[PDB]
């Protein structure tokens, strides 16, 4: 219903052997589409969705440039930060940033955000009012202080409400196709014997996109929540997804046990059974 | 469209 365009920025010092690693990764609707790696030779902004090959040569030149500069900016922030946290010069550290825009169904900025983190803890963030900062600590205070001093909030807000939101549109139109696509899960129930005249029933779900899916096990119409082993959903690398849910059963009583697969691509929730 | 980050130029704890 809503949609979004976020960029994930990573900087990692790899000392004492030189240049930090710079990583930028763009996602529309939580699907990667552009990426930048300081670590390749000929480091450049690459497309990671075919519908993005559609963009000209002058697009990539533009984004690379900015990436290049951003990289240089974090290269020193990494090094500045050690001094402020009285930290040893040998070890490696991590600046991370998430910035982008979620938009409503009415194509309007719904929540804008930009949050930094140093070594996996919060460091500073933009507040919902798009005008103020929250500083995680004494170090981030000085940053916040300068960023107010220089009128940063307004300049980001421009990007956040303007540029970002416009380009989410351009990317969407570009990809209505590949993005709102939908593959229903292929499901089947395996069976394995357990020592004590027990059985394990495993309900499988394979090759589905998008990634959210809920499978459930019941007997006598009641879901068996405190009985299921169930794995985090995982990439086939297709990129479809996989997930399974299993549960212990007495040998013979299996026919009383049903599996249930709720996923947005299938018209009516599946109801499965062995054999 | 990637934004151009401003330098943090921090100091502190």
């Amino acid at each position: 219903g809503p949609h979004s365009l976020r960029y994930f920025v990573t900087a990692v010092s790899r000392p004492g052997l030189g240049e930090p690693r710079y990583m930028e990764v763009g996602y529309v609707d939580d699907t990667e589409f552009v990426r930048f790696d300081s670590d390749a030779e000929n480091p450049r902004y690459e497309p990671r969705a075919r519908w993005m090959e559609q963009e000209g040569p002058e697009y990539w030149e533009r984004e690379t440039q900015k990436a290049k500069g951003n990289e240089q900016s974090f290269r020193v922030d990494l090094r500045t930060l050690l001094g402020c946290y009285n930290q040893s010069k040998g070890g490696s550290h991590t600046i991370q940033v998430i910035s982008g825009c979620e938009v409503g169904s009415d194509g309007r900025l719904l929540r804008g955000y930009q949050q930094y983190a140093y070594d996996g803890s919060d460091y500073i963030a933009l507040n919902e009012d798009l005008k103020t900062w929250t500083a995680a600590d004494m170090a981030a205070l000085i940053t916040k202080h300068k960023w107010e001093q220089a009128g940063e909030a307004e300049r980001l807000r421009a990007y956040l409400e303007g540029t970002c939101v416009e380009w989410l549109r351009r990317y969407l139109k570009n990809g209505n196709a590949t993005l709102l696509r939908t593959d229903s899960p292929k499901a089947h129930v395996t069976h394995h014997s357990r020592p004590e005249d027990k059985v394990t029933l495993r309900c499988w779900a394979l090759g589905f996109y998008p990634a959210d899916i809920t499978l459930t096990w019941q007997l006598n119409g009641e879901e068996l929540i405190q009985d299921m082993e169930l794995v985090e959903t995982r990439p086939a690398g297709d990129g479809t997804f996989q997930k399974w849910a299993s549960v212990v059963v007495p040998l013979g009583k299996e026919q009383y046990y049903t599996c249930h697969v709720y996923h947005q691509g299938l018209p009516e929730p599946l109801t499965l059974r062995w054999e | 469209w990637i934004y151009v980050y401003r330098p943090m130029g921090c100091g502190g704890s």
Partner: T-cell receptor
């Protein structure tokens, strides 16, 4: 502040020339521009920071080393009279922010 | 990312009102600048604004970020003659900064 060395310079065609720019601002980006009648400020080389050197609009004739964050120098490997001109160095805190310029250097090249 | 300012020379008398023309072509949301370059010297940021539509002022010049026109017209209520200099307009959305020929202002007493 950004300063330029030397400020004035005479050189014979075919010789080597280095203009160095040293910058007290703590800036990553630096640019070398050339300036002359009818064309104004034209970018030659620039540097996102210590290490890199990217070509600008009119690189032929010039090479630029970026040893540290403080120094950016351009080198006319073997000079021509077409490179007689006034040269300007600028620094920049980040990408597309204000530029701070040097006082320029006057370079006449004659055979 | 481009800028066009249609005046090569402009000259006037002191106390005259000054107006120099600026329109830009850009793909992102550029911040906008006026740079001034007093003869003998290198250029210097006269003024900037980052958001439409506000106006910057320095040394008694001003200019408004005119998105509807894509304009950044430099205006001064009473041009003095210290102000004789070359004035450069410029946008920037994260490109590298280039400069036109700008406008050569001669103020005469």
């Amino acid at each position: 502040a950004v300063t330029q060395s030397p400020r004035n310079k005479v050189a014979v065609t075919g010789g080597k020339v280095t203009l160095s720019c040293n910058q007290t601002n703590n800036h990553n980006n630096m640019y070398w521009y050339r300036q002359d009648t009818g064309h104004g400020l034209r970018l030659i080389h620039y540097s996102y920071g210590a290490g890199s050197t990217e070509k600008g609009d009119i690189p032929d004739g010039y090479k630029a080393s970026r040893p540290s964050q403080e120094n950016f120098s351009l080198i006319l490997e073997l000079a021509t009279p077409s490179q007689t001109s006034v040269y300007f160095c600028a620094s920049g805190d980040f990408w597309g922010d204000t530029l701070y310029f040097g006082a320029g250097t006057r370079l006449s090249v004659l055979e | 990312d481009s800028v066009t300012q249609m005046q090569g020379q402009v000259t006037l008398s002191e106390n005259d009102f000054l107006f120099i023309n600026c329109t830009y072509s850009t793909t992102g949301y550029p911040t906008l600048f006026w740079y001034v370059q007093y003869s003998g010297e290198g250029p210097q940021l006269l003024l900037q604004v980052t958001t439409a539509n506000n106006k910057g002022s320095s040394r008694g010049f001003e200019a408004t970020y005119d998105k509807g026109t894509t304009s950044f017209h430099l205006q001064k209520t009473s041009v003095q003659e210290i102000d004789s200099a070359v004035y450069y307009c410029a946008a920037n959305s994260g490109t590298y900064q280039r400069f036109g020929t700008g406008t050569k202002l001669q103020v005469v007493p």
